[PDB]
Symmetry: C3
Subunit: 319 residues, 3 copies
């Protein structure tokens, strides 16, 4: 249905000439939102994003193509499926970057209820996807509890200490904080902050965190399914906090938390929690070899919860 | 009158360290608009752009200088002349990039008619340009019909087939589609989409199309005179469609079509045609040699119309 | 209090892979503004900036960290102190970039007076800084007169001529003019232009001016304390004029003037003077050696005033 093509320029690129993952997340979300709004005919905001995995890391000079489609509309929400291809403009070769799902919610104005049409079903796949959407919705809705329950099976005893020869390090020097002011290009015409914009900012903070652990070149491997818990509008300040949670050989998990404050809330210290997300990075050296991250040694009560958290999340993924 | 200077940074650059043509079009249009508004004292939108040819391709590290002036004001419209120079900041050498004309229309608010002053005429050239503007206006106004009539002299018989040894290729794999959401930085303070912004987006889609034919490094040589057919505002989605129309040795023509939809129109499938444009590209290889494009083999009814179209347009240019 | 972290990407970089000084000024100002607004709970605009000196020039691939804090609140204004660190992401090494002060003014809406709380004082330094703020405020307020008085001691006789073998050059070919349209991302949600945005634009014009003198690679060394003389809003055009004022061996002073016009004022030729600033640059050659600038030969009445001006400013700095 909706198709976006973007040539990767220096402006979208990192130090290493690779597409910023955050930039890609923003583009995915924009395409998805437009697919939702083509179905709904009103403005739509990002409700949640499913697990997204990146199969390639696109480079300056290549062209990204993003296709998004409404697979099913429920009451106020719809599931959007997204496919991202990359094409090399010298060899003409195309590769799959990512296949993903995002959920959008229609935001009518202002006291009118919205009536979402039935999505048109033509091919076999259209009908299969329409069923699968109800299943995928169940996973979305049970996700918080699934994790919360796995956490009950983890130790909760903070006595874990690695040997001196293990070479474990603390995560303390990998914490990162940043802040962004939400401006009119960051929000739709009703002033609601784009979810893609939040994701792009998230990822940029998170990558710095990964960098402070390996001192190499991180690239994003995946982001876990997460929910936008509440609205953000123009004028908000979004405060980002990220830290490494755990390592698993060639993977590191960085968690990031996003809090919103309007000008008043900002002075009064009381913000809203917009979302939290968990990003897995790999990293390469200058000879392009995969880096093995050190073992992590949790110290604080928070350190430990996040060490177990990354584990619970990893096991939920592998399944 | 109005002067803009821009140092070319990585942010404005392509993969090859060259100024994005689309970025240059946006800058030209901004300077021109400011010249129009300095004369009109109200907000002004891009009505049309004349043929624009690029004599050099500027590079990261050089400085662009753009001078625009109102040459003549009519009733609601005025002709703006633009000159673009590039300076190399290591050798100090300046070169002409482009000499161009654009027409702007005053958009008063909201029920008041606008009274355009007579442009001040001082030098010989001021008086010559004032006359030439009336002529150039005639060419602008007769342009659609001039083309439409040349098309009557072309074959209209779709039987054209190149030999197998000719090595002609179809244009099918060079089509490109993209989409842009119009946000507040993309429009003036009355919400009207900048024409320069549309041009920048146009060119970025078009260059991808040229790339899919040669698998090299395109650079823009010219854009044909074209008209903005109707307004666009914040909240519109602009859908771009581009394809190669024809080749002429070292030149390829890419056409691009721009349709606007507000949120309602977007869901109801009924958009407005904003403009269509036709861009000529050259391309270089990695040893910096001009590429010769393959011969084009039209297949569909559309293929043929655009094959003839590029010819009609080329002949109108050469004259 | 307020912490911003930014990884330096190609998008923020110059031709030479170095962070744009203007980009850094924008980031400093944003962080500072957020510190002011965290204290005031209303929107705050940049009133003035103190002397700022840059100790390092950060590069693509490094991470900037900016910490800003309210040191003292007066009646409507507050002093903000800022510290900028840079971290190399390969060696993990951190270096001080800059320590600075900026003054913000609360802009309540619209007929309500603002009541600024007393800043909380905890550490020794908190109490020292609170006193020092009253002193630093005195320097801010006496700055225009201090300069004006030094100028009385300078020659005012325009007879200064350097020998032919001195190799002095005129500044005439280093003047630069540019223009920027103020758009919604350039202003807070009340439409007031960000001071940081003006600074970023200032610096980009000024660096071109330095470039036209040495034909090398300028990097910003410092900006003098200056005042924003009046408000700017969305829709303004900001006209920048810059020229080299004087040279002092490895330093060159570039002055820049900023005038604002709304659409009406723009057509009627009557603008507002927003600020003027004076920036000192060094420059390196391609083998990374410091460039020695030529001696400057003033010619016009303006040339001479600015030659003396740069001197007065230099002496005020050294003290
Ligand atoms: C998403 C949101 C609307 C749902 O909030 P809520 O308090 O749970 O309200 P409800 O439980 O009544 O759910 C409303 C709809 O959202 C859906 N929803 C709730 N949680 C979801 C999740 N984790 N994943 C997918 N859909 C979800 C529900 O299925 C429901 O769909 P339906 O109306 O078609 O049946 C709300 O959390 C929100 O506004 N989030 C922020 C949206 C936003 O502003 N995004 C831009 C970035 S800030
Ligand atoms: C340009 C526009 C105002 C003229 O539309 P129109 O339906 O042809 O109306 P008119 O025929 O009455 O022409 C109005 C004026 O535009 C001029 N005009 C029309 N077509 C033109 C063209 N191809 N080139 C130059 N000027 C043109 C006319 O000469 C006339 O000038 P005048 O009033 O000084 O004598 C209209 O097409 C439009 O709004 N285009 C979009 C403008 C815009 O929003 N640009 C931003 C990018 S979307
Ligand atoms: C800064 C500004 C508010 C002060 O203007 P003014 O005509 O001098 O008015 P006042 O003399 O009554 O001063 C008002 C306050 O600004 C302070 N102020 C004035 N000049 C100052 C300077 N050079 N440095 C620091 N503070 C200054 C005063 O100390 C006073 O503080 P207080 O109320 O807490 O005691 C005014 O110049 C302005 O609006 N500047 C533009 C602000 C702006 O829009 N910035 C964004 C970029 S355009
Ligand atoms: N104060 C902080 N400093 C650094 N990183 C943080 C901080 N708070 C949260 N984070 C990161 O954001 C993630 C999400 O935070 P949160 O939603 O509070 O859940 P949890 O701490 O249980 O993981 C954390 O896992 C962590 O990686
Ligand atoms: N569906 C499409 N797919 C790819 N490119 C297109 C498409 N439609 C239009 N274009 C490009 O945009 C140009 C302008 O289109 P249009 O105004 O419809 O005129 P025409 O098709 O007669 O040239 C076309 O020449 C073509 O190059
Ligand atoms: N017309 C101009 N052309 C080029 N540069 C200018 C021009 N006007 C001002 N500038 C630069 O801006 C600076 C500030 O200008 P202004 O506030 O008028 O003070 P002064 O001219 O006394 O220094 C000048 O020092 C100069 O370097």
């Amino acid at each position: 249905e909706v198709v976006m093509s973007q040539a990767i320029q220096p402006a979208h690129a990192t130090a290493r000439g690779e597409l910023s993952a955050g930039q890609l997340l923003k583009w995915i979300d924009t395409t998805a939102c437009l697919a939702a709004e083509k179905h709904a005919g009103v403005s739509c905001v990002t409700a949640s994003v499913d697990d997204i995995q990146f199969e390639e890391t696109a480079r300056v000079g290549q062209v990204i193509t993003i296709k998004a489609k409404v697979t099913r509309a429920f009451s106020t929400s719809m599931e959007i499926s997204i496919k991202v291809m990359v094409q090399d403009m010298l060899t003409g070769i195309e590769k799959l970057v990512s296949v993903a799902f995002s959920t959008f919610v229609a935001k009518p104005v202002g006291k009118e209820k919205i009536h979402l049409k039935p999505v048109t079903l033509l091919t076999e796949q259209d009908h299969v996807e329409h069923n699968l959407a109800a299943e995928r919705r169940k996973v979305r809705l049970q996700h918080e509890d699934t994790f919360n329950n796995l956490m009950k099976e983890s130790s909760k005893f903070d006595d874990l200490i690695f040997d001196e020869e293990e070479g474990a390090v603390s995560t303390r020097g990998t914490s990162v904080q940043s802040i962004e002011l939400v401006l009119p290009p960051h929000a739709n015409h009703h002033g609601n902050t784009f979810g893609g914009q939040i994701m792009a900012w998230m990822e940029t903070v998170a990558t710095i965190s990964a960098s402070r652990l390996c001192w190499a070149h991180p690239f994003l491997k995946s982001v876990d399914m997460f929910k936008f818990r509440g609205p953000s509008t123009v004028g908000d300040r979004l405060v980002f906090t990220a830290i490494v949670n755990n390592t698993f050989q060639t993977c590191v998990e960085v968690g990031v938390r996003v809090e919103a404050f309007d000008c008043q809330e900002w002075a009064e210290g009381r913000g809203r929690h917009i979302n939290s997300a968990f990003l897995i990075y790999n990293a390469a050296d200058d000879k392009e070899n995969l880096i093995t991250f050190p073992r992590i040694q949790p110290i604080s009560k928070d350190d430990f919860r996040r060490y177990r958290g990354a584990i619970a999340r990893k096991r939920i993924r592998l399944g």
